[PDB]
Amino acid sequence: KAAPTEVSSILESKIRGVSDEANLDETGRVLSVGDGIARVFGLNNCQAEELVEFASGVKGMALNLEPGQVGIVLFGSDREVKEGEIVKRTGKIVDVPIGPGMLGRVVDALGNPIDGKGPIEATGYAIAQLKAPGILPRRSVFEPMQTGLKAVDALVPIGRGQRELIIGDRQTGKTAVALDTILNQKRWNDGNDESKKLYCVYVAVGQKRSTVAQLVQTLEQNDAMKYSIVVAATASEAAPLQYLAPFTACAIAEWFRDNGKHALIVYDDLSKQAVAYRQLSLLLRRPPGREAYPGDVFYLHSRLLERAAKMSDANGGGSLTALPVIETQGGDVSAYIPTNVISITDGQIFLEAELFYKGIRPAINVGLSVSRVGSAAQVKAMKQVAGSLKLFLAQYREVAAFAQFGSDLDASTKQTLSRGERLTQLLKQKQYSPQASEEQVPVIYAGVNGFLDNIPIERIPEFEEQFIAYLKANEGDILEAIRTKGELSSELLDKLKSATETFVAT
Amino acid sequence: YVAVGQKRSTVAQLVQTLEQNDAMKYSIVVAATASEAAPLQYLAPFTACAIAEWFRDNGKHALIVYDDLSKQAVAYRQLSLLLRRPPGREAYPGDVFYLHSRLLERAAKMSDANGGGSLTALPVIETQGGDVSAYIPTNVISITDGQIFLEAELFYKGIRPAINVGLSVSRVGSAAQVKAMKQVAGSLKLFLAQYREVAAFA
Amino acid sequence: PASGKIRAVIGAVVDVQFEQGELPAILNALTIDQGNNQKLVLEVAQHLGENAVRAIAMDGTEGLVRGQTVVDTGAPISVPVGRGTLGRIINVVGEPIDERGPIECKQRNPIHADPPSFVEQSTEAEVLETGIKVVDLLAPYARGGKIGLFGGAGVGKTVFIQELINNIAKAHGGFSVFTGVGERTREGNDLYREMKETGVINLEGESKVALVFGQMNEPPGARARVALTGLTIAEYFRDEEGQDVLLFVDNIFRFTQAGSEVSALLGRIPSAVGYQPTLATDMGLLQERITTTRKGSVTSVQAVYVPADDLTDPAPATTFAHLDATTVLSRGISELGIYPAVDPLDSKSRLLDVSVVGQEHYDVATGVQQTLQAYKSLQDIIAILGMDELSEQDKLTVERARKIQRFLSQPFAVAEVFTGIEGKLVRLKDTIASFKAVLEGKYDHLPENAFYMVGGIEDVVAKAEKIAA
Amino acid sequence: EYFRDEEGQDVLLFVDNIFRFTQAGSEVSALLGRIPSAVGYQPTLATDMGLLQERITTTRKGSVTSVQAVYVPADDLTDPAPATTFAHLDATTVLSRGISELGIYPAVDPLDSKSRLLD
Amino acid sequence: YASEISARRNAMDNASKNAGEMINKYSILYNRTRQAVITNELVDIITGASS
Ligand SMILES: Nc1ncnc2c1ncn2[C@@H]1O[C@H](COP(=O)(O)OP(=O)(O)OP(=O)(O)O)[C@@H](O)[C@H]1O
Ligand SMILES: Nc1ncnc2c1ncn2[C@@H]1O[C@H](COP(=O)(O)OP(=O)(O)O)[C@@H](O)[C@H]1O
Ligand SMILES: [Mg+2]
């Protein structure tokens, strides 16, 4: 029945004169402010998702353009805005800075530097709400993404241009897999090959102020923050800054894929970005849906994840990786926000809290995590050892219940239990200790052939460091040939079997 | 026959089978597919009961088959949710039980002073996994005089039709049956339910 | 031309104000000029009154100001139909997204149209020959119905859709229409490149399947209207040319989720499990159009996805009422030695009766299903008691059940680069005669490996005599 | 009530069923301006049920043995029309659906039926 | 000892078969309770926002 806009104060202006101010297009008057929402009266020339500016200095984004008023979401505190303040329009959309000058500094959600290192040399300005790539400008995932983990490079191997989800519970291996993959790219980014490097893009959304400072200090000590973008977006800001953190970080990382380089975005986390979008929609007088979310809940996460794809040779040859972490409740992977992110991505890495307390570092379930790319985006040297290890790991998981009754084991049951326990313990790595492709191919070949069955279960940790150190001083030609060529011929298979048999006698 | 909620191809194939066996000359067909509006499918039960009530009030018997009762409840909830109403259990309005009880109460047997006719109602309830304790399942069972449970476990083994003797019963079916079939089937309903429980544990 | 002015713009919902008498009706496409884009389609939903009607945009509404020009097309969302859309990637608005020029179509049919009447429908349920040995004998597909393709990743869902479209175009002469509604960005590019290397989509030759792009990166209006755009091109080939077209909707669960997103943002109240109120009206308006008419039929082979492994949900029970057949692809076979992984006991259909396929086809289907069900239930006792601790009747039935499970798995024509065998296209009469002779004892002396990767009664006799000598 | 107050006789009130009084008012409560309560019920559920159950009691002039029957909504005793009527009855006779399928005639649940005279 | 080991295998097979039937009945009740919890939670947020 009733409406807003013209009411009492705004209604007693058109009766005396139908003119007053000649603007009513580029400016507006604030009529109601609260809960991070400002109902600016006027601004007829303001476009959708356009930047605004108040009289106190706080910025806004007009997203609910009505017929009488204009709902703008303030990016700061609501104490600076009041009833009757002037709100001007910027004339442009919500954009952010991009280019090669943003590497080495921590930016916010709008592109402003917060690390305190001066200005950022931006080479371009890209919008936040950008379109994804089409079906004609995309190619197959052929490049391999070296993560460093032995259980990630052999099982669910991710490639350049795909979307690998990082599902898990609280403190189970969510942010640990993303931090080890970005720090393992130091062997390719420090060289001269531009096609082998991958610029990281950590987008901390929903975290606290102490969590963002601890992650940036650890990457600078290992020479990993010089080519990694940091998008600071804490929970102490407004709901508009945290919800637009996924779109602003994807626009800055898209400049490298469109030029001829590779990028890797890590949206940490995907659960915090969905809570920021539903908070601004509930205050703008909109209808809700399931789990107190808007109607475009599935379209908000699918639009930002489809832009990270692998381009073809006619577009430049670049790619972009999306590592969204889905923070689950209590291990339920079939929830509301968990099911939407797993169906849109081409693979998901599950992390259970029960396997992390047993000794598996990190807790990565092989029976629940899978990759849609398969062995097409991996090295040829590591694909020969991962083919036989996948069949042995699947057979040992189904027959793992017979481990409690070792006095009734047969011949085939004792061979699968001894080989399955040594393969799972060899893939367990420590924190911030990534391995290369040459060191992981020699460790996986000794456990799949049968050279590690004679050793004990407790000596699996000491055998990983003894075999890697002896192979770098005695047989250095076999490790260097597997990394340069990337495959294994007939001469490399005979030299690897003779070196592993001579070192297993001591 | 009141086909409510069925597909367009299923209504055309069922009418052709009854005409070939000399059964469509004295049977009314109420077509109500799901491709129409929500008001046409919800009013299909009330319109079919008015046509069959003319024979019971004059001196003839009628048999109404509302297939299905589960499809009519979903069509009535669509028009009520769009008019800003209160949704109760299973996203249903407060008048969900009154819509099925009013249409089933008219199918009764008249006395000798009203003509002597009667109207039989055969409503089909589509259960979701055998859940007989649902909102639409308990409302139709409390207004009808008996039910015929169709279990999906015995239907896949070859027992067609799968009629559970321990679940299906008839209130006014003992006195409204033939004397020749009731005398030859002495204690057939009690021996069928006791033989199913003894065979499952042996 | 009827012009309008934009009054509101809240996300996908955009209200336009027209004049008196020139107001558009429901389901009317509205044109809007943008910058880099050609035209922003906006389907009309309802009219709020006072010379105003709310519409839902089918693209991004970012950059629209209050007072923009909104032209009315006068009809619904038209799309290009005919033989010119074969081999090209179309969208929800009928535009090409393959960068291969515009679709030179003679006419343009609207996406919003009524279905067939009760007098123009088929009075008898006919069976559709697919060519596979495990499809024409077990769960037979109905001519003009819906078939559910349930299966996981890497089981054989993409290979089954390509082999069924090539066999229907050579034995019956019918085209296909792949409408991937709610698909991913990487899944759309991999499906177009794989069809060109097998012979289904030819850029210089002759194509036989239509491509309809419909990713989830757009708004709620483009994903919900993706099913109507793909069904309009397949229905034109059966009414004007008269051919049994096959429509593919991957997946079927994305069509029900896209309809509730645009309804919840307009002002409608939700239903059960957060679904829309018109669940039975939106799903029945698109499933009734793919039926059998007097000139042709239109089969549907959508992939139904259960929500969190629940068949009693609102998106699973509503789509199962109109499905006549089901193609369940379990993960039990695949690596066991079956090409493809077709379950002979889980895949059921309503057209597998004696009054639709005959008394000869019903007896062969019941005998093969009874032998496969007894061998699957006896697998737990054979691993604990051996294979020689059985009776005379149980030993003969267990040997024939092993060869019958591999005889129904024939090699397709598009899967010749993965197995090495040639493509076998068995007909309906050849598959029923080969299964009846093996159950009577005429092929009891043959080996178990002679029926694997073979099709028909003539292929089993030539492979058994050439294996030994 | 007139036979127990003006005449002084032990009346016997038999309602079948008592759950239909609360279900009839919930369908008309949405059109009168009242907001919905739990499970789409009316807000005055305890006020409308308490005004009718208090008048069917025993007074100084005469007694009134009320023998009403409640209907469980979809076999659920935690509903707003079943749990609110349990605080205005001296003796309750809950009939479970699990004991009726076994052969118990009737399905008198001994673990749920309670009364105030069991002493 | 052979008769007790043979009788223990039959009791273990009956216990595993009885556990499968109870898990199937509990899965049908958990699926209906999950859909009812989503409808009850969405009805509470829609009633408070419309008043
Ligand atoms: N593979 C591992 N081996 C040993 N410790 C690990 C491993 N992975 C993670 N941790 C420990 O877990 C702690 C938290 O790791 P991480 O930051 O990845 O999760 P988180 O972000 O704290 O999770 P949440 O956000 O739920 O609190 C770290 O302090 C680290 O020491
Ligand atoms: N007739 C067949 N013979 C042998 N292998 C097959 C056959 N059909 C399918 N496959 C295998 O199934 C796999 C399917 O892969 P993909 O299409 O990526 O997954 P999905 O089928 O689930 O979409 C292919 O790698 C192929 O090798
Ligand atoms: Mg974290």
The whole-angstrom Rg of chain A is 27 Å
The radius of gyration over CA of chain E amounts to: 22 Å
How far the N terminus sits from the C terminus of chain A, by CA atoms, comes to: 88 Å
Q: What level of helicity do the residues of chain A show?
A: 25-40%
Q: Strand order, main sheet of chain A: write it out.
A: 1-2-5-4-3-6
Summed up, the helix count of chain A is: 14
Greatest interface:
A-C, 52 and 54 residues
Bound molecules: adenosine-5'-triphosphate, adenosine-5'-diphosphate, magnesium ion
Report the biggest beta sheet of chain E as strand number plus sense, adding barrel if it closes.
Answer: none
* Beta strands of chain A, count: 17
Describe it.
The structure is cut from a larger assembly and holds two copies of chain A, two copies of chain C and one copy of chain E (51 residues). Chain A is an alpha/beta fold. Chain A has helices at 175-183, 186-189, 209-221, 239-243, 245-257, 270-282, 297-305, 337-344, 380-398, 411-426, 437-449, 460-471, 476-484, 490-503, and strands at residues 27-34, 37-42, 50-53, 59-65, 69-74, 86-93, 95-98, 106-107, 124-127, 165-168, 199-205, 228-233, 262-268, 319-322, 325-327, 347-349, 370-371. The longest helix of chain A is centred in the last third of the chain and has 19 residues, at 380-398. Chain A starts with 26 loop residues before the first strand and ends with a helix. Chain C is of the alpha/beta class and 469 residues long. Chain C is built from 13 helices and 17 strands. In chain C, the strands form five sheets. In chain C, strands 1-2-5-4-3-6 form a six-stranded antiparallel barrel. In chain C, 53% of the residues are buried. Chain E is built from one helix and no strands. The longest helix of chain E has 48 residues, at 2-49. The relative contact order of chain E is 0.07. Chain B binds chain D through residues 85-89, 92-95, 97-98, 133-135, 137-138, 142, 166-167, and chain D through 23, 26-30, 36, 39-41, 71, 73-75, 97, 101. Residues 153-159, 339-340, 411-412, 415, 418-419 of chain C line the site of adenosine-5'-diphosphate (ADP). The PDB classes it as hydrolase. Keywords: ATP synthase, hydrolase. The entry is titled "Structure of F-ATPase from Pichia angusta, state1". Chains A, B: ATP synthase alpha subunit.
